[PDB]
Amino acid sequence: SKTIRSRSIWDDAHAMLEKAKAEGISTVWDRAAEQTPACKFCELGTTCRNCIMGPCRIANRKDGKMRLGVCGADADVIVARNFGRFIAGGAAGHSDHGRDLIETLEAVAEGKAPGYTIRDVAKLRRIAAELGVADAATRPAHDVAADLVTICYNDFGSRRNALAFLARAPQVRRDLWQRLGMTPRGVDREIAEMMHRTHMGCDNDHTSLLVHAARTALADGWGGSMIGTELSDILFGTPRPRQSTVNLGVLRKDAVNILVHGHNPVVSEMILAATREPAVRQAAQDAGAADINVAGLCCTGNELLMRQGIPMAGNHLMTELAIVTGAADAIVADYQCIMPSLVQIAACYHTRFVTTSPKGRFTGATHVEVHPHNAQERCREIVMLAIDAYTRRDPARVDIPSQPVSIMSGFSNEAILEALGGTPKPLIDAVVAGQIRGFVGIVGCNNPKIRQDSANVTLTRELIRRDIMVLATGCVTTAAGKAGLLVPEAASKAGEGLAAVCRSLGVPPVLHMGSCVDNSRILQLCALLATTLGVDISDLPVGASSPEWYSEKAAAIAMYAVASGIPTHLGLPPNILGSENVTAMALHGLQDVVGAAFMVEPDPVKAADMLEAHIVARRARLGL
Amino acid sequence: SKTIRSRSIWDDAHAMLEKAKAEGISTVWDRAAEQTPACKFCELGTTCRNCIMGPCRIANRKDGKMRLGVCGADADVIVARNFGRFIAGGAAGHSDHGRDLIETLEAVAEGKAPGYTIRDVAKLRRIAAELGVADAATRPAHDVAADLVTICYNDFGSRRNALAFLARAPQVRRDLWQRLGMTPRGVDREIAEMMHRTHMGCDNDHTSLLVHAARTALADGWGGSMIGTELSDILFGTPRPRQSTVNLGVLRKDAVNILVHGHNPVVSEMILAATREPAVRQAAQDAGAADINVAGLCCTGNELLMRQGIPMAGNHLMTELAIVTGAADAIVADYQCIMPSLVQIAACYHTRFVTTSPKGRFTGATHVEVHPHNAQERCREIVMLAIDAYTRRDPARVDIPSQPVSIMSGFSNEAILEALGGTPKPLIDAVVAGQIRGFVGIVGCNNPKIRQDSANVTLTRELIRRDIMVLATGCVTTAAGKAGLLVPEAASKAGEGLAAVCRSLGVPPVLHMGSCVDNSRILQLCALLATTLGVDISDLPVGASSPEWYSEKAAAIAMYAVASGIPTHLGLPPNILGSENVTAMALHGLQDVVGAAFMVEPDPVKAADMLEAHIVARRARLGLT
Ligand code: SF4
Ligand code: SF4
Ligand code: FES
Ligand SMILES: [Cl-]
Ligand SMILES: [Cl-]
Ligand SMILES: [Cl-]
Numbered sequence A: 001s002k003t004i005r006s007r008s009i010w011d012d013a014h015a016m017l018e019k020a021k022a023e024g025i026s027t028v029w030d031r032a033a034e035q036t037p038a039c040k041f042c043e044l045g046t047t048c049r050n051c052i053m054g055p056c057r058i059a060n061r062k063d064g065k066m067r068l069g070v071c072g073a074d075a076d077v078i079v080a081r082n083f084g085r086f087i088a089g090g091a092a093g094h095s096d097h098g099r100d101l102i103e104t105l106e107a108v109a110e111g112k113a114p115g116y117t118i119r120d121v122a123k124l125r126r127i128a129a130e131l132g133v134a135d136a137a138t139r140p141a142h143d144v145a146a147d148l149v150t151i152c153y154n155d156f157g158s159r160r161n162a163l164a165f166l167a168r169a170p171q172v173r174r175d176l177w178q179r180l181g182m183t184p185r186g187v188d189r190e191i192a193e194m195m196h197r198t199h200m201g202c203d204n205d206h207t208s209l210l211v212h213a214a215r216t217a218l219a220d221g222w223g224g225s226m227i228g229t230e231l232s233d234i235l236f237g238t239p240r241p242r243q244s245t246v247n248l249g250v251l252r253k254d255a256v257n258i259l260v261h262g263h264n265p266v267v268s269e270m271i272l273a274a275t276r277e278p279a280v281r282q283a284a285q286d287a288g289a290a291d292i293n294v295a296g297l298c299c300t301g302n303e304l305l306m307r308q309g310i311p312m313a314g315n316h317l318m319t320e321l322a323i324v325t326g327a328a329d330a331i332v333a334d335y336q337c338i339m340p341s342l343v344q345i346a347a348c349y350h351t352r353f354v355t356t357s358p359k360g361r362f363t364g365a366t367h368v369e370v371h372p373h374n375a376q377e378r379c380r381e382i383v384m385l386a387i388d389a390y391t392r393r394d395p396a397r398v399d400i401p402s403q404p405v406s407i408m409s410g411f412s413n414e415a416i417l418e419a420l421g422g423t424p425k426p427l428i429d430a431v432v433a434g435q436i437r438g439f440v441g442i443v444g445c446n447n448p449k450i451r452q453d454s455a456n457v458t459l460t461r462e463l464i465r466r467d468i469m470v471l472a473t474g475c476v477t478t479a480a481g482k483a484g485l486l487v488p489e490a491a492s493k494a495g496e497g498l499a500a501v502c503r504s505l506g507v508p509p510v511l512h513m514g515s516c517v518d519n520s521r522i523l524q525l526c527a528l529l530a531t532t533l534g535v536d537i538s539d540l541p542v543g544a545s546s547p548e549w550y551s552e553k554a555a556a557i558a559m560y561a562v563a564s565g566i567p568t569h570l571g572l573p574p575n576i577l578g579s580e581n582v583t584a585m586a587l588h589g590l591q592d593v594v595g596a597a598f599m600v601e602p603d604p605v606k607a608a609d610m611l612e613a614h615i616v617a618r619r620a621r622l623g624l
Numbered sequence B: 001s002k003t004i005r006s007r008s009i010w011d012d013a014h015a016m017l018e019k020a021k022a023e024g025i026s027t028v029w030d031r032a033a034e035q036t037p038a039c040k041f042c043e044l045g046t047t048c049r050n051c052i053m054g055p056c057r058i059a060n061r062k063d064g065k066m067r068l069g070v071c072g073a074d075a076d077v078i079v080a081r082n083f084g085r086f087i088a089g090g091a092a093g094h095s096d097h098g099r100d101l102i103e104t105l106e107a108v109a110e111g112k113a114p115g116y117t118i119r120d121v122a123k124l125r126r127i128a129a130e131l132g133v134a135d136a137a138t139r140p141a142h143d144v145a146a147d148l149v150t151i152c153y154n155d156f157g158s159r160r161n162a163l164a165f166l167a168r169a170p171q172v173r174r175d176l177w178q179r180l181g182m183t184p185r186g187v188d189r190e191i192a193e194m195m196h197r198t199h200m201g202c203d204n205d206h207t208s209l210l211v212h213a214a215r216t217a218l219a220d221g222w223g224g225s226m227i228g229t230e231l232s233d234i235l236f237g238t239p240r241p242r243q244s245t246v247n248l249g250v251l252r253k254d255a256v257n258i259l260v261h262g263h264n265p266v267v268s269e270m271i272l273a274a275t276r277e278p279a280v281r282q283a284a285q286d287a288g289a290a291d292i293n294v295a296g297l298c299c300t301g302n303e304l305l306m307r308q309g310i311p312m313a314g315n316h317l318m319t320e321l322a323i324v325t326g327a328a329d330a331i332v333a334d335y336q337c338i339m340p341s342l343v344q345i346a347a348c349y350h351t352r353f354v355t356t357s358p359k360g361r362f363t364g365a366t367h368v369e370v371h372p373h374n375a376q377e378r379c380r381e382i383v384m385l386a387i388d389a390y391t392r393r394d395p396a397r398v399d400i401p402s403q404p405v406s407i408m409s410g411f412s413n414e415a416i417l418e419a420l421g422g423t424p425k426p427l428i429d430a431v432v433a434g435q436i437r438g439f440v441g442i443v444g445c446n447n448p449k450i451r452q453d454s455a456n457v458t459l460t461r462e463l464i465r466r467d468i469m470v471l472a473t474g475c476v477t478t479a480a481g482k483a484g485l486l487v488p489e490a491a492s493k494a495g496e497g498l499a500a501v502c503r504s505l506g507v508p509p510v511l512h513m514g515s516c517v518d519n520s521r522i523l524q525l526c527a528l529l530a531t532t533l534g535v536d537i538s539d540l541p542v543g544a545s546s547p548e549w550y551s552e553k554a555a556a557i558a559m560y561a562v563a564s565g566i567p568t569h570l571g572l573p574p575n576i577l578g579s580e581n582v583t584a585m586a587l588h589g590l591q592d593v594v595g596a597a598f599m600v601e602p603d604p605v606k607a608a609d610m611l612e613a614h615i616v617a618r619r620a621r622l623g624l625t
């Protein structure tokens, strides 16, 4: 089918799209077509629904009418407020994620989280000492954890002048933030202040609104997400390199297939542990299965991949198709990016759709709520539901379409530094020598507006060919993985300089650095490289790119990348083009404020040219 | 003009609308007409922009298309998420306001706020003791203040199971909230969680979303707003009854007129103090003025009215018209409900438009930022800017249209209890005897969709005629004031029972209880009455109404009133009618969950009937006639 061919580059997606059509199942692509064309005001950002003096629409008319909202706000204010709330929603997703990790580490410290423990005590003592816990090296681990919990919770309070992890950024960058009024102070506080500023008659200056949008996003990258990443490593282990597989072929016809979907490893790690219990495995055998097969979707899949090597079934636009295989015995979801259509598609089969979070409620789902105190018992209950669902699987509707593709995951900063011998000097030397011209983090989503993973894969191939190492996170992981680029042998696809470094280290030219919260690792790596060189992050040969983004979370990541000094490419524009001034600020003006700006370019080859050009200019700023 | 008559019931508004039209000045009414008809999907709530898989619209088409967003979300989810973010924006406005008061009290306790003091130490010690500060009755005031600051900041953290002031609610109500998952835990936390829940692929159950909307609003009424009110009383004094005046006639042709606008008294109290410095008064006289004349707009005006008796120039839809008088020499703004049109209208005159908050930035304004450590110095600079602007006032463009109307303000709960002799017993006795059949808080805004204050005033008149005492806050204050209902003599307009009680106490039938954050005073009063009677707030003969609301803050107030058990009337619907299920939950389903629901009724006489009928039903359950 020509329609099916245009929706994805992958054979496993094509096969399930044909199967979905044959069974009359509507997918995200079908609903995207129904919503095209979109409302032009909504797409431009020139619409406001923030009070019931409105709603209002703005147009650039010669007769002067509809130039202002009822309150008098112009297009610049309305667009900037909409963008600010958009970013705030993204930051809030990461904020609540990080908060849940704090609450879990606290439950461990109190001895009230059966089945949870401190799995990297060394990192616990290191992070606690870094953030100022007294005698972190020698005090009992639970006491050190309790003090770290208090520091993290205080960053979710209203009394700080700067977030705890912000001290990682170079001094020149913290000084710049302080002067600009951009320093993030509290993870929840910046979000709440954004919602206040965007109320009618509060912040009515587009520049001020965008500066606080930067501050809100920085409170994510250096706050909610960084706390999420570092505490997840403490609770579940610091990732180290390991082999795994990717695509729908990780599902097994002869096993109980449990797909974990969503974001928080507090749930998926305990689902995994439940499947490994002897009596639970025995119950699956008694049902006729060969074993229990856990496979990951989206970010929680990234987390199990990074720490346990659990194979990943797919990314955002693969989620509906994973159920269409007919082999998904249960989906276990927590929150964020879980399309509610999955509840209806699961209803077409035997599949149990299980929700686990009080925040991720889906009408018609099977709710088995999970908290640290009951997770071990509840996750065992959930696996038994999956085994019971497996006994009702219709074999005539099963179609697992592909063979899995080998990948290498686990590239935490700890893992990168260990592969380098313990210091960043061999990496710095390769950059100075020009073997590695720079680094680009390719992050973010899929979007039905772009043929699935076409731009993600093309940009990855273009960059490594130009001796630019790629750091992959989020749903881009599945793209690079299915393209064969997450293995050391993919050095054959890189330019001469990058291939030589990769082969000397035994690593791929594309390093999987984790989930979307683990974009905080890229911030940490840039801060480390800048501090070692005595420069700003805005002087490093780095870039960021989300060629196929969709979510508010992705926009917040892009904003905190830009605000931290990292030129950031987006394949698609945010809904801001109705304000020329807001657009010019995002694409150009921010360069003169924070030392980086957004780029919007749907051609991934042209995006590669633009990212490379910034890297070249940065290499000149360093006199290379 | 028939068009001008239809926009407001007030002569001062009519006069300035005529003047604005003659000078070619566009007002909020003119822009409301340009924006009518509105977008159908935006009006119904059936549109979503929460990701760039969209934007999406939900339609009812024969081919069945556009029933779902690209992610699969239906109309119920989209409408509920939109209403949830709407509520979170209102809660956030009050939240940041309360936070600023915490930071001000902390600066005072540290001795780093020249010109600020603890004006009500007795209330400081009482509130601190109520919230658990050890030895609040005896320790040094600055130590007690530091400990109270810590308790208030902890409610803006992420470690509480319940907000500190929630203990005021009766146990039965706290038990209900706890079972429902509605207990507010952290003022910022609930707002952040709402923004998370409304991200694509998180909370996709409309009942769940509305329950968290209730929790988010409760974190305002029992958190951000109540902290704001109580700390404002501690810093600037507990309101007591006093006389003042209202309407555009409070401006003086012979004076430097400084209009304070916005919400935070931390600024307007220090502007007022600066105008009272002898050297600053002398500068105004040397410029030709008789004096400096501070007048209030919107909530910061309510604040200065309640605590200093400062006359109030007008409410929401009067704000542009106050500049059209040609006598506004400076507008001093902080944040919230400040229409950016005021910047352009000021530019048509000599008026200086001064912003004072890092949060309230206006392109083209004169920014003179104010913080506790520099407010005394900066507010003096702002008043000197106003005196300079006065020297450039064009006398030929001045038209102050009316004579001011006398009002009585200052009815804090402390003042009400003092008028009752120290206890609520005489008020309960009047309620039991049926002299006062019930109480209704009339709160909230103006809205160009309704002839200004027509519904505010008609509802107030209808209720007091039916022996229902009215508690007025926000922009309703100005409406009742200009109607002549905020004075003791207005008992003549109430029914026989309410008139007798009012005359025995010497109070008006309409009690001004302050600004929009001071709607927390109404929550405190209901909680006190419920606890004294041993019932829930949902058992009290009470109601709430915003006949002419517009803001997200007003919806958050309505939501936390409903969630606390207060039947709440809105003159206009929120943008939710695109979902019958969400609408039915708001208007009916909540009744069975929290003991109260929303009502939507644009006819203020019918609104009076519905509010009274709820009051009659609650009086029956108390065993009264
Ligand atoms: S805030 Fe202003 S632009 Fe937005 S809906 Fe209200 S009146 Fe219209
Ligand atoms: S969240 Fe769902 S309904 Fe909203 S814009 Fe995105 S795809 Fe459309
Ligand atoms: S749907 Fe109302 S403006 Fe786009
Ligand atoms: Cl035109
Ligand atoms: Cl508590
Ligand atoms: Cl009722």
Ligand SMILES: [Mg+2]
Pocket (backbone or CB within 6 Å): A103, A106, A107
């Ligand atoms: Mg706990």
Ligand SMILES: [Mg+2]
Pocket (backbone or CB within 6 Å): A180, A181, B358
């Ligand atoms: Mg500033």
Ligand SMILES: [Mg+2]
Pocket (backbone or CB within 6 Å): B103, B106, B107
């Ligand atoms: Mg301070």
Ligand SMILES: [Mg+2]
Pocket (backbone or CB within 6 Å): A358, B181
């Ligand atoms: Mg619950």
